[PDB]
Amino acid sequence: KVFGRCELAAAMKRHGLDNYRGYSLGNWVCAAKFESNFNTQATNRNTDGSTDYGILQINSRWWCNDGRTPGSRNLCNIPCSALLSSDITASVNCAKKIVSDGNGMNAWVAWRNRCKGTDVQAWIRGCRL
Ligand SMILES: [Cl-]
Ligand code: NA
């Protein structure tokens, strides 16, 4: 599913991401825009053989099982394919674990390079929330 900007903001808010670990909603929308272009079906393979999955590009080396990342963990206790669903619940629940892991949203490279320090409230402007 490709979400609209305000549609995704509303779904993220309903699932508890606004101000989760101190990160306002616009940070999460900005990260999703640059990680996946709001597309739940996005995948990207990394040089180490791991793959990033879904709207927040969650990586199989640590967070989900895809059966093809040797030596990896599955800390979210999910198949990686669950992160591609039109329902973002599994992605949000796993993102909550990631952002709690010590580095905050710096875990998302696109957030650190394209969202951090910018006017992230622009991403929720005009939305009925
Ligand atoms: Cl947009
Ligand atoms: Na933090």
JSON list of C-alpha atoms in Angstrom, two decimals, residues 1-60:
[
{"chain": "A", "resi": 1, "resn": "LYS", "atom": "CA", "xyz": [0.00, 0.00, 0.00]},
{"chain": "A", "resi": 2, "resn": "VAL", "atom": "CA", "xyz": [1.28, 3.54, -0.73]},
{"chain": "A", "resi": 3, "resn": "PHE", "atom": "CA", "xyz": [0.00, 5.82, 2.04]},
{"chain": "A", "resi": 4, "resn": "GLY", "atom": "CA", "xyz": [-0.84, 9.44, 1.69]},
{"chain": "A", "resi": 5, "resn": "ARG", "atom": "CA", "xyz": [1.12, 11.78, 4.00]},
{"chain": "A", "resi": 6, "resn": "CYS", "atom": "CA", "xyz": [-1.78, 12.70, 6.30]},
{"chain": "A", "resi": 7, "resn": "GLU", "atom": "CA", "xyz": [-3.23, 9.19, 6.16]},
{"chain": "A", "resi": 8, "resn": "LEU", "atom": "CA", "xyz": [0.06, 7.78, 7.48]},
{"chain": "A", "resi": 9, "resn": "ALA", "atom": "CA", "xyz": [0.33, 10.48, 10.14]},
{"chain": "A", "resi": 10, "resn": "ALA", "atom": "CA", "xyz": [-3.11, 9.52, 11.44]},
{"chain": "A", "resi": 11, "resn": "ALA", "atom": "CA", "xyz": [-2.28, 5.80, 11.46]},
{"chain": "A", "resi": 12, "resn": "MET", "atom": "CA", "xyz": [0.99, 6.45, 13.29]},
{"chain": "A", "resi": 13, "resn": "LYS", "atom": "CA", "xyz": [-0.78, 8.62, 15.88]},
{"chain": "A", "resi": 14, "resn": "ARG", "atom": "CA", "xyz": [-3.42, 5.95, 16.51]},
{"chain": "A", "resi": 15, "resn": "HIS", "atom": "CA", "xyz": [-0.66, 3.43, 17.12]},
{"chain": "A", "resi": 16, "resn": "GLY", "atom": "CA", "xyz": [1.06, 5.60, 19.73]},
{"chain": "A", "resi": 17, "resn": "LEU", "atom": "CA", "xyz": [4.09, 7.05, 17.87]},
{"chain": "A", "resi": 18, "resn": "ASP", "atom": "CA", "xyz": [3.42, 10.78, 18.55]},
{"chain": "A", "resi": 19, "resn": "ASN", "atom": "CA", "xyz": [6.05, 11.76, 21.10]},
{"chain": "A", "resi": 20, "resn": "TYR", "atom": "CA", "xyz": [7.15, 8.14, 21.62]},
{"chain": "A", "resi": 21, "resn": "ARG", "atom": "CA", "xyz": [10.57, 8.39, 23.33]},
{"chain": "A", "resi": 22, "resn": "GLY", "atom": "CA", "xyz": [10.24, 12.11, 22.77]},
{"chain": "A", "resi": 23, "resn": "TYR", "atom": "CA", "xyz": [10.03, 12.04, 18.98]},
{"chain": "A", "resi": 24, "resn": "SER", "atom": "CA", "xyz": [7.16, 14.13, 17.68]},
{"chain": "A", "resi": 25, "resn": "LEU", "atom": "CA", "xyz": [4.94, 12.70, 14.94]},
{"chain": "A", "resi": 26, "resn": "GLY", "atom": "CA", "xyz": [6.57, 14.66, 12.11]},
{"chain": "A", "resi": 27, "resn": "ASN", "atom": "CA", "xyz": [9.89, 12.84, 12.75]},
{"chain": "A", "resi": 28, "resn": "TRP", "atom": "CA", "xyz": [8.21, 9.47, 12.03]},
{"chain": "A", "resi": 29, "resn": "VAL", "atom": "CA", "xyz": [6.46, 10.73, 8.90]},
{"chain": "A", "resi": 30, "resn": "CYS", "atom": "CA", "xyz": [9.68, 12.28, 7.61]},
{"chain": "A", "resi": 31, "resn": "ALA", "atom": "CA", "xyz": [11.57, 9.03, 8.23]},
{"chain": "A", "resi": 32, "resn": "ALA", "atom": "CA", "xyz": [8.94, 6.99, 6.36]},
{"chain": "A", "resi": 33, "resn": "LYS", "atom": "CA", "xyz": [8.98, 9.40, 3.41]},
{"chain": "A", "resi": 34, "resn": "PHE", "atom": "CA", "xyz": [12.73, 9.09, 2.86]},
{"chain": "A", "resi": 35, "resn": "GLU", "atom": "CA", "xyz": [13.07, 5.42, 3.81]},
{"chain": "A", "resi": 36, "resn": "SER", "atom": "CA", "xyz": [10.24, 4.01, 1.68]},
{"chain": "A", "resi": 37, "resn": "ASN", "atom": "CA", "xyz": [8.38, 6.82, -0.09]},
{"chain": "A", "resi": 38, "resn": "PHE", "atom": "CA", "xyz": [5.40, 5.77, 2.08]},
{"chain": "A", "resi": 39, "resn": "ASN", "atom": "CA", "xyz": [5.27, 2.33, 0.36]},
{"chain": "A", "resi": 40, "resn": "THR", "atom": "CA", "xyz": [4.69, -0.64, 2.70]},
{"chain": "A", "resi": 41, "resn": "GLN", "atom": "CA", "xyz": [6.08, -3.06, 0.09]},
{"chain": "A", "resi": 42, "resn": "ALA", "atom": "CA", "xyz": [9.53, -1.44, -0.16]},
{"chain": "A", "resi": 43, "resn": "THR", "atom": "CA", "xyz": [12.57, -3.72, 0.17]},
{"chain": "A", "resi": 44, "resn": "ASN", "atom": "CA", "xyz": [16.27, -3.00, -0.20]},
{"chain": "A", "resi": 45, "resn": "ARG", "atom": "CA", "xyz": [19.20, -5.41, -0.01]},
{"chain": "A", "resi": 46, "resn": "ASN", "atom": "CA", "xyz": [22.35, -4.36, 1.83]},
{"chain": "A", "resi": 47, "resn": "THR", "atom": "CA", "xyz": [25.96, -5.28, 1.09]},
{"chain": "A", "resi": 48, "resn": "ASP", "atom": "CA", "xyz": [26.18, -7.49, 4.16]},
{"chain": "A", "resi": 49, "resn": "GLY", "atom": "CA", "xyz": [23.34, -9.71, 2.78]},
{"chain": "A", "resi": 50, "resn": "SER", "atom": "CA", "xyz": [20.68, -8.35, 5.10]},
{"chain": "A", "resi": 51, "resn": "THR", "atom": "CA", "xyz": [17.52, -6.73, 3.72]},
{"chain": "A", "resi": 52, "resn": "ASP", "atom": "CA", "xyz": [15.45, -3.71, 4.86]},
{"chain": "A", "resi": 53, "resn": "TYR", "atom": "CA", "xyz": [11.67, -4.16, 4.85]},
{"chain": "A", "resi": 54, "resn": "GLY", "atom": "CA", "xyz": [8.55, -2.00, 4.80]},
{"chain": "A", "resi": 55, "resn": "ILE", "atom": "CA", "xyz": [7.56, 1.55, 5.41]},
{"chain": "A", "resi": 56, "resn": "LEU", "atom": "CA", "xyz": [10.36, 2.10, 7.99]},
{"chain": "A", "resi": 57, "resn": "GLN", "atom": "CA", "xyz": [12.97, -0.11, 6.27]},
{"chain": "A", "resi": 58, "resn": "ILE", "atom": "CA", "xyz": [13.56, -2.39, 9.27]},
{"chain": "A", "resi": 59, "resn": "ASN", "atom": "CA", "xyz": [16.65, -4.58, 8.88]},
{"chain": "A", "resi": 60, "resn": "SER", "atom": "CA", "xyz": [16.84, -8.38, 9.03]}
]
